[PDB]
Amino acid sequence: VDIAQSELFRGDIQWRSFHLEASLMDALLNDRPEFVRLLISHGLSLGHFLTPMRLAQLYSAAPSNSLIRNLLDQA
Amino acid sequence: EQSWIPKIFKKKTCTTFIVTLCQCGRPRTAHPAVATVWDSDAHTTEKPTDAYGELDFTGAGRKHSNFLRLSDRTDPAAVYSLVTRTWGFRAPNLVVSVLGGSGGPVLQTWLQDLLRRGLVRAAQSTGAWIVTGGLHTGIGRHVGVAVRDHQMASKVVAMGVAPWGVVRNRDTLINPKGSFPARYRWRGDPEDGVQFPLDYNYSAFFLVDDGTHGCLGGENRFRLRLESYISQQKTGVGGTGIDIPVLLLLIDGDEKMLTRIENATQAQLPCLLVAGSGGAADCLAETLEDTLAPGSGGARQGEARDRIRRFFPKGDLEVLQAQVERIMTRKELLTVYSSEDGSEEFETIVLKALVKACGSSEASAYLDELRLAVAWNR
Amino acid sequence: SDLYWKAQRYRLIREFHSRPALAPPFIVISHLRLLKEAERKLLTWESVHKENFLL
Numbered sequence: 001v002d003i004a005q006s007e008l009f010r011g012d013i014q015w016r017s018f019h020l021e022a023s024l025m026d027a028l029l030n031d032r033p034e035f036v037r038l039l040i041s042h043g044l045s046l047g048h049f050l051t052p053m054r055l056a057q058l059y060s061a062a063p064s065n066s067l068i069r070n071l072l073d074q075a
Numbered sequence: 076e077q078s079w080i081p082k083i084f085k086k087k088t089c090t091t092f093i094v095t096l097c098q099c100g101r102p103r104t105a106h107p108a109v110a111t112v113w114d115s116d117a118h119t120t121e122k123p124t125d126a127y128g129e130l131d132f133t134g135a136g137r138k139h140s141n142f143l144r145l146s147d148r149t150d151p152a153a154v155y156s157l158v159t160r161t162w163g164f165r166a167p168n169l170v171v172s173v174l175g176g177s178g179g180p181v182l183q184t185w186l187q188d189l190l191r192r193g194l195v196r197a198a199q200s201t202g203a204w205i206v207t208g209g210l211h212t213g214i215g216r217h218v219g220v221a222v223r224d225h226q227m228a229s230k231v232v233a234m235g236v237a238p239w240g241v242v243r244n245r246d247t248l249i250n251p252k253g254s255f256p257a258r259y260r261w262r263g264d265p266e267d268g269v270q271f272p273l274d275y276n277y278s279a280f281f282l283v284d285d286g287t288h289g290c291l292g293g294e295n296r297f298r299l300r301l302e303s304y305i306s307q308q309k310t311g312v313g314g315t316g317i318d319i320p321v322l323l324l325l326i327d328g329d330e331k332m333l334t335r336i337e338n339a340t341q342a343q344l345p346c347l348l349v350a351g352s353g354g355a356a357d358c359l360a361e362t363l364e365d366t367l368a369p370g371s372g373g374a375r376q377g378e379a380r381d382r383i384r385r386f387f388p389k390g391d392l393e394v395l396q397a398q399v400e401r402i403m404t405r406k407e408l409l410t411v412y413s414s415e416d417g418s419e420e421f422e423t424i425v426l427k428a429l430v431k432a433c434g435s436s437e438a439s440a441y442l443d444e445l446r447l448a449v450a451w452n453r
Numbered sequence: 454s455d456l457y458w459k460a461q462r463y464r465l466i467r468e469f470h471s472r473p474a475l476a477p478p479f480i481v482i483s484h485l486r487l488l489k490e491a492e493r494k495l496l497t498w499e500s501v502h503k504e505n506f507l508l
């Protein structure tokens with residue numbers, strides 16, 4: 001994350017909320033804690049970001065035959 | 076108990092007509108029968124003020140908000156005497172005048188945290204004053220929610236100056252005999268971009284009347300005049316007290332604010348600018364970072380910043396560059412607050428700014444800054 | 454064990470909190486008789502302390 005913050009988030013590049021929505025999903029799906037903290041910290045509106053389709057996508061990322069995955073399958 | 080208020084204060088009306096629509100925003104049909112280039116003072120009529128009183132916001136609130144409408148051409152001395160004596164407001168140990176536009180309904184989370192944690196706690200600790208725009212928009216709203224969040228987590232005297240005309244529900248404030256009971260429809264359903272509601276977190280309201288139906292920048296003259304008079308005032312008890320430091324906090328802004336800071340610096344008032352605020356405020360911070368940069372390769376850097384740190388309109392114009400040059404002519408007064416990845420601590424910055432602004436060997440001039448150093452724990 | 458006793462102390466108090474006020478020999482008559490802004494302010498106060506603790 002230090003490389004990304006030092007290079008991409010040095011302030012020279014003008015970012016946008018939609019420019020980070022895809023990356024935010026990737027960090028959440030790939031278990032990147034420092035990145036989601038960094039991405040949200042850079043003025044990202046979480047309330048408008050989260051959608052029921054996105055939430056369903058997040059729960060669909062249960063790792064293989066995990067215990068949680070079994071509960072959704074039963075549910 | 077407010078008999079002198081209509082007498083020692085005045086209100087401004089449009090009077091003449093200077094075009095269907097004139098410059099005052101009040102159209103031809105609704106106009107006095109007394110009806111080139113409009114003049115705020117030559118084309119206005121002075122009448123006794125008829126909007127003073129104590130506002131009581133509907134619902135949650137302190138049931139006390141002293142709001143007064145006063146003409147622009149008024150001495151700040153009378154206003155300060157009214158606030159300190161009649162309204163019972165204690166003489167402030169510090170006055171912070173938050174300035175800026177802060178374009179956008181929302182601001183950065185770190186910026187909001189610095190406002191709520193840094194400014195409000197520092198104001199609360201020393202019993203300071205926070206003078207902002209008395210409107211529920213821009214920086215005025217942001218400081219309003221910061222005060223409200225701190226208050227409910229525990230007061231802080233934060234008042235607002237707003238032009239007369241841009242205030243919604245101005246019909247319920249009119250009572251020449253006094254508006255001590257007053258109900259405000261701050262939650263009015265209709266929304267418009269020329270009239271904004273008053274925040275419910277401000278202890279006092281100063282409605283600047285200049286004979287217009289509503290615009291921006293009509294309170295700048297009174298705002299600077301009030302700040303300078305307080306800076307040249309003692310903390311009560313007559314002359315036995317010490318001076319009251321006055322500091323200006325700047326976040327973002329536009330061309331109108333750039334004149335404000337230049338005028339304030341001309342008025343010998345310490346200024347404080349925060350890095351990363353946005354356009355028209357980081358330009359000064361970057362120019363401070365260059366400091367005594369050489370003219371060769373740096374003279375055009377001003378115009379480069381004019382186009383990248385500010386909007387394209389007036390960027391090619393060198394009038395703003397002249398304003399920049401005038402500002403650095405007294406660069407000792409103003410200082411920059413480094414974000415430091417969200418320091419949320421600027422009492423040291425304020426103390427450093429105030430101590431460097433005085434520049435007097437006499438210990439009397441440094442008494443006020445000493446008390447603030449005592450009031451805070453640094 | 455000291456932690457366990459402290460934890461189970463709440464269970465004892467809750468059990469006796471809802472018990473009828475009379476003694477078991479006389480408990481029959483008791484059995485026969487048997488048959489906003491403040492919340493938001495509190496949460497903000499808690500949240501402020503959380504950020505202070507984290508900082």
Ligand SMILES: [Ca+2]
Nearest residue numbers: 318440441443
């Ligand atoms: Ca001083």
